[PDB]
Design a protein around this ligand. Sequence first.
Ligand SMILES: *[C@@H]1O[C@H](CO)[C@@H](O[C@@H]2O[C@H](CO)[C@@H](O)[C@H](O)[C@H]2NC(C)=O)[C@H](O)[C@H]1NC(C)=O
Length: 173
Amino acid sequence: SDLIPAPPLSKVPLQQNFQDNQFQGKWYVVGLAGNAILREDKDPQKMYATIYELKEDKSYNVTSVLFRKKKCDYWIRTFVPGCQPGEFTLGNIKSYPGLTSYLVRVVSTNYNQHAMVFFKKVSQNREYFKITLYGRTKELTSELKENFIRFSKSLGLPENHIVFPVPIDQCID
Ligand SMILES: *[C@@H]1O[C@H](CO)[C@@H](O[C@@H]2O[C@H](CO)[C@@H](O)[C@H](O)[C@H]2NC(C)=O)[C@H](O)[C@H]1NC(C)=O
């Protein structure tokens, strides 16, 4: 199992002045890229969504929804504020078999339109990294999508490892 090496953090920007309250709400995953992300053609990835909710202890209750096989699959997650506003670790790791690492980095966002988030984790000892292009709506500008493509590449990902989930109306509305 061969993988493209996770980029060195110094290459992953952090959203200047992150506002955890404004980043709340529903986000559409309009762009996906990772060393474990492949541009399938016989069955293109469907768009799923992720809802971020602040807890009073300032942690996020991240829950996602995807339409898998005639149903909505929901998966919960708790992000815990890291060392700098915008960074996050995984709450209750250890309740996730094979997980020794997990990190989130809000690269950039305008809180109303879009956002770019970098994730990196170590499962089974294999290092995985990915980047989601978030959209407040199910679609966005070409400017934003090529910016996403540009960044993914700066991290070592070939076009091939960059995909745009096709918009759907099931479960993510
Ligand atoms: C974060 O999620 C937890 C559960 O994931 C929410 O806890 C719920 O809290 C209410 C009121 O205290 C309870 O009635 C529910 O039973 C709890 N749910 C669970 C699964 O334990 C919590 O409210 C969330 N916080 C926000 C602001 O969304």
